[PDB]
Structure formats: structure tokens, C-alpha cells
Amino acid sequence: TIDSISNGILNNLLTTLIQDIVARETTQQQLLKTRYPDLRSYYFDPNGSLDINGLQKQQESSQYIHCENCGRDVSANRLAAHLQRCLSR
């Protein structure tokens, strides 16, 4: 009864804590499922080769960005360099 009380006190703290942890998990998924029935989980390519939604890397050479100050398009991979002499002009 010196230990019966201890293991009780412990099991009490343990259970309240287990029940709290789980309560928040079931609560959150329950919301996710109801809110987004069409739930797309994030893709996990075992190589880091694919996106969160399982896409191939873009390889943007084509990708351009319309610069506001210039009237032209600028290769995305050169917008930082382009501004450092477009804005100053």
C-alpha cells in the first residue's frame, strides 16, 4: 500500500497524458477528413527526387518573369542580376 498508491498516482498521470495526446490526434484528423475529403497527402519519393506532390524538378531555363520597371521578360535565373542594373538605371 506504500507502492499501491505510487503506481496508482503514476498510472493516473500517465493515463491523463495518454488520453490528452490521443484526443488531439483524433480531433485533428477528424477535422482534416471532414474539411478535405479529397485529401492528397504529401508524396514521399525515397530519393528526394520528387516534390511534395511528386513532381519532377522544373529545370527552369524557359521560365521568364515580367519585370515591372523594364517592359520585358527576364530569364528567371537572372532576375537578381537584372535588377541590380535595371533599377539603378
Binding site: T1, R24, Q28
Partner: protein, 84 residues
């Protein structure tokens, strides 16, 4: 084995409604279950901005209908009413 609660202990302490706490809970400043009040005023800054378990649940917000800004679940009312 155990049998009996020390008489001096009972002599000091161990000799219904939860809705009754509202009176002092309004007297009382924001408290945290993990972050201790005393140790916060000692090892942290008085003006410290705090969040209990920041990664407990996803961030809770709603998107305005017309500006599309992501509003905090506490800045929504004041935003619709005037700032949008």
C-alpha cells in the same frame, strides 16, 4: 505497508461546481500548463511573446473572401469590418 495519514499533515491541510471559478479566473492572467509562471518571469523577458505548443495543431486561420489574405482566427472580425 501504509495505514494512516500523518496527524500534523491533516492538521494543516487534508482534513462542487466548476462554473464557480469564473470569478477569479477573470482576476487571473493567462497561465500555461507547461511553462511555469515563476520561472518565466525569472529566465525570460516580462514582455515575452508566448505560444504553448506552437506545433500542436496546424495553424488555424481563414481566408478573406475578396482580398484573399490569410486572416488570423482573431483578426478576422476587425478586418472584415474596416480594413479589407
Amino acid at each position: 505497508e501504509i495505514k494512516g495519514i500523518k496527524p500534523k499533515v491533516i492538521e494543516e491541510y487534508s482534513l462542487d461546481s466548476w462554473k464557480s471559478l469564473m470569478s477569479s479566473a477573470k482576476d487571473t492572467p493567462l497561465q500555461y500548463d507547461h511553462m511555469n509562471r515563476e520561472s518565466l518571469k525569472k529566465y525570460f523577458n516580462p514582455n515575452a511573446q508566448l505560444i504553448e505548443d506552437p506545433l500542436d495543431k496546424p495553424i488555424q486561420y481563414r481566408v478573406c473572401e475578396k482580398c484573399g489574405k490569410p486572416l488570423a482566427l482573431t483578426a478576422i472580425v476587425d478586418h472584415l469590418e474596416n480594413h479589407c
